[PDB]
């Protein structure tokens, strides 16, 4: 059933699983038409398919051309997500295929169950966790590859960079969800925290800066403070 606080450690066991987030699949700007009506213009999107254990990210870029002449786009986006996840699983070798797929939004369960009928042994699960994977497009390099795409494209990243050399999956996932939670609450402030010291850079083959273990503690602390400040404002408490 549903993935929650009670069964959190299951994410870091040796059964292959993937999170699927469809938040950024269908993206629009709303604008006024000449006649003063409202219209949307789609922009490039992406499916966020993450192995929480390894950090392997399957960033499937959703090019605006997939919406051309289609109706009920927010509905179609869920089925297009399920089609692309199904295709990704079918493309993996058997020993790499997940045992579970966890969807971050319950509206993905039926579309993904129906697309995965050929895989009865792959459990499709919801989550009670409020995961901040919507903020993936606040990671400059993921944002850059999505917006530059001129056709459908699958790009592979490790969202943990080289962290697993020094820390466990559990700690790497906590760090990723804290960074994404900060980027989601106050993007400008989060990004300032991450680059404020010019001497710490992002390696060409990484997404995040090359922080020492002590600098990660300072950053993580600054991210927790940012999140509470913002929460104090939101709620006046």
């Amino acid at each position: 059933g549903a993935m929650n606080s009670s069964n959190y450690a299951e994410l870091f066991n040796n059964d292959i699983k993937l999170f699927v987030d469809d938040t950024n699949v269908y993206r629009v700007t709303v604008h006024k038409t000449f006649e003063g009506n409202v219209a949307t213009k789609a922009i490039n999107g992406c499916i966020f398919t993450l192995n929480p254990k390894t950090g392997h990210l399957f960033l499937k870029i959703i090019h605006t051309s997939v919406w051309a002449g289609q109706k009920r786009l927010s509905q179609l986006a869920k089925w297009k997500t399920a089609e692309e996840v199904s295709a990704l699983v079918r493309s993996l070798p058997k020993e790499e295929q997940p045992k579970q797929i966890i969807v971050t939004r319950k509206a993905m369960l039926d579309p993904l169950e129906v697309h995965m009928l050929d895989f009865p042994n792959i459990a499709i699960r919801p989550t009670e966790l409020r995961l901040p994977f919507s903020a993936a497009m606040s990671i400059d390099k993921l944002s850059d590859v999505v917006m530059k795409a001129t056709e459908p494209q699958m790009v592979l990243f490790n969202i943990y960079d080289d962290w697993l050399d020094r820390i466990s999956s559990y700690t790497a996932f906590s760090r990723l969800t804290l960074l994404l939670r900060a980027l989601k609450t106050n993007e400008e402030s989060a990004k300032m925290i991450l680059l404020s010291d010019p001497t710490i850079t992002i390696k060409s083959y990484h997404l995040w800066p090359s922080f020492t273990d002590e600098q990660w503690i300072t950053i993580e602390s600054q991210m927790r403070d940012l999140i509470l400040t913002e929460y104090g404002r939101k709620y006046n408490v």
């Binding site: 179609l76 089925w79 399920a82 579309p111 169950e113 129906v114 697309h115 009928l117 050929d118």
Partner: protein
């Protein structure tokens, strides 16, 4: 007009014949039901006074043989049996009739209710859902599980309704996942109507039979089957006009006949709200929508 004689009534029991029912006292000189309309299936059904659990009964058609009821004190129930000796049977009936120990099937002349509930129900189709090929009549009770319920455990005592599963390879063509899930027309028209049932009459007969089993026995899997067969039609954008017209009539008489006090257990809120208000056929069930709105507005 045909007769089902009873050897006796040794235990106190509420006897049903179709939509009618009669209380019989322990050792009351009751010897059966006469004037049963030829041309329809019928169901005789039982609920013991001393254990109102296990409603059970027999689907039969009087054109297929001479049937009687006899209490078996070992198995503790009223059993249907066939009398193969025509002259013995007519002589039993004529005697009981002369001594007026039979109740008369109480059909009002104006009243087409039983015809309307059984319009497409065929005894040969019942015998394929309820497999006991040595009898011409079919036993059903409250507790018998369906083949679908058993998959998700004695196959001999199963109800073999056609399995309907909206999230199955049977229901979803590879590469038409979204189309077939949101518009079940291919599942209804190609798989079920052309493929399995062959025609809408067999589909309606199973639907009507699932309903009657739900209503007369409180058979839970029958209720699931009735709702599934309604939902498959309502969730299809493309249905022949004649099927929609007939479905409205079928459902109207089912809703009309349902005991008012059983709508809480026998009717599924989600299916009915979806079929009448959200589905493709939301506007195609005028009679059904009007009786549901006027008789069960709480459920909606």
């Amino acid at each position: 007009m045909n007769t089902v004689p009873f050897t006796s009534a040794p235990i106190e029991v509420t006897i049903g014949i179709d939509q009618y029912s009669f209380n019989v006292k322990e050792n009351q000189p009751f010897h059966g039901i006469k004037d049963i309309p030829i041309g329809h299936v019928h169901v005789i059904h039982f609920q013991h006074a001393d254990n109102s659990s296990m409603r059970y009964g027999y689907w039969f058609d009087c054109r297929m043989g001479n049937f009687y009821i006899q209490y078996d004190p070992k198995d503790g129930l009223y059993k249907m049996m066939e009398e193969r000796d025509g002259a013995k049977f007519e002589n039993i009936v004529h005697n009981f009739k002369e001594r007026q120990m039979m109740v008369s099937y109480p059909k009002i002349d104006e009243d087409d209710t039983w015809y309307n509930l059984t319009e497409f129900v065929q005894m040969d189709k019942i015998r394929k859902i309820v497999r006991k090929d040595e009898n011409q009549f079919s036993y059903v009770d409250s507790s018998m599980t369906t083949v679908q319920e058993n998959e998700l455990s004695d196959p001999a005592h199963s109800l073999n309704y056609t399995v309907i599963n909206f999230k199955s390879r049977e229901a979803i063509r590879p590469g038409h996942e979204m189309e077939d899930f949101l518009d079940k027309s291919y599942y209804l028209n190609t798989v079920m109507l052309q493929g399995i049932f062959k025609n809408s009459s067999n589909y309606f007969g199973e639907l009507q039979f699932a309903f009657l089993n739900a209503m007369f026995f409180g058979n839970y899997g029958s209720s699931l089957q009735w709702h599934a067969m309604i939902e498959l039609i309502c969730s299809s954008a493309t249905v022949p006009k004649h099927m929609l017209d007939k479905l409205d009539e079928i459902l109207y008489y089912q809703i009309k006949t349902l005991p008012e006090q059983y709508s809480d257990i026998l009717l599924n809120e989600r299916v009915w709200n979806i079929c009448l208000y959200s589905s493709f056929q939301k506007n195609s069930l005028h009679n059904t929508e009007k009786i549901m709105e006027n008789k069960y507005p709480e459920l909606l």
